[PDB]
Amino acid sequence: TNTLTTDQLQELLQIQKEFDDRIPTLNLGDSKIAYVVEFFEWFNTLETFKNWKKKPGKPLDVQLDELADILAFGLSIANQQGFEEYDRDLFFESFDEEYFLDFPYLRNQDMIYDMMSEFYDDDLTSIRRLVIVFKIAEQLYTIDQLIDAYKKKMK
Amino acid sequence: TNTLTTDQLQELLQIQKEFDDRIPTLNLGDSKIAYVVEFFEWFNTLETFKNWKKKPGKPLDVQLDELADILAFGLSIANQQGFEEYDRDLFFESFDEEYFLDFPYLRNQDMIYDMMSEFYDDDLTSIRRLVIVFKIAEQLYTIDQLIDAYKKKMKRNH
């Protein structure tokens, strides 16, 4: 129904934790950088700046597979910083409140400047990274489509 | 074979011009976004943040082909704004002056944050965009390898 429950979120955090447990070299600095790199890879699949293309936008399954990479690093960063009940409650409060990240904006190629703006601020929260990826799923795709692409990626 | 001459630069601007002349929808705003997206595509090929891979890094030819995309949009942005002898001289002056962009710096995955801080600056210049890509070529690769990858790219694009 295009909603995210705390149960779903905790399940996703558990799947990432099990994946990341197999990486003894895991570190927050690298994971935060990968999130930004994967964001740009996803943004590139939208092709909203590619005026030279007749039919802009990669296939939906390709856009979703790239969105799922962002989700993976967002979940990982949240696990690595610690993501407990306190953090979930903040996430859902922010997520329900958030109205800036809607369909037309995300379609506007200029949004990438607002994202970079957030990404080089060292104080960006694990909450914010997850709000962004789920809002993109909720407004441009569905949450279920993203969760499906993520689970496929992880198995 | 790791130097850039004004003859070489004028030649690259002319190649980009001939390509872009064939794109009736060309616009500067989209080209400035494309430069940044392609910068990140190239940075992803280094894999310097991928501690979970044993031997990180895409093939050298893949790295150079992505570096050449950055060069293409930097040349395009320069051409679209107007880039005359006056600007070429300022470019070479900057390029020669540039000493922050060295092998150790580019090596460091944290460098992307410094790049982002330039990319989100509305006042980022066309000269600076070209200094960045040619310095990356000079320091991590060679300028000649970048030019060669770019010229091939532009022949496959027509």
Side-chain angles (χ1 to χ4, degrees), chain A residues 37 45 49 62 77 87 89 113 125 132-133 138 143:
Chain A
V37 176
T45 68
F49 58 91
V62 172
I77 291 162
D87 309 274
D89 290 356
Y113 289 114
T125 321
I132 289 167
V133 67
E138 177 195 72
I143 291 172

Side-chain angles (χ1 to χ4, degrees), chain A residues 23 25-27 30 32-34 36-37 40-41 43-44 49 51-52 73 109-110 112-113 116 119-120, chain B residues 23 25-27 30 32-34 36-37 40-41 43-44 49 51-52 73 109-110 113 116 119:
Chain A
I23 307 174
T25 54
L26 197 73
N27 73 94
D30 285 350
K32 288 178 177 178
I33 286 165
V36 173
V37 176
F40 273 93
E41 301 280 341
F43 179 68
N44 195 23
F49 58 91
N51 59 69
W52 48 89
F73 285 106
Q109 55 264 51
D110 283 357
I112 200 55
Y113 289 114
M116 298 197 264
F119 296 163
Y120 63 87
Chain B
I23 308 176
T25 57
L26 196 72
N27 76 97
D30 285 350
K32 289 180 176 178
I33 288 165
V36 175
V37 178
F40 273 91
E41 232 205 320
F43 181 68
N44 195 23
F49 58 88
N51 63 73
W52 54 88
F73 285 111
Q109 56 266 52
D110 281 355
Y113 289 112
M116 299 188 70
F119 298 163

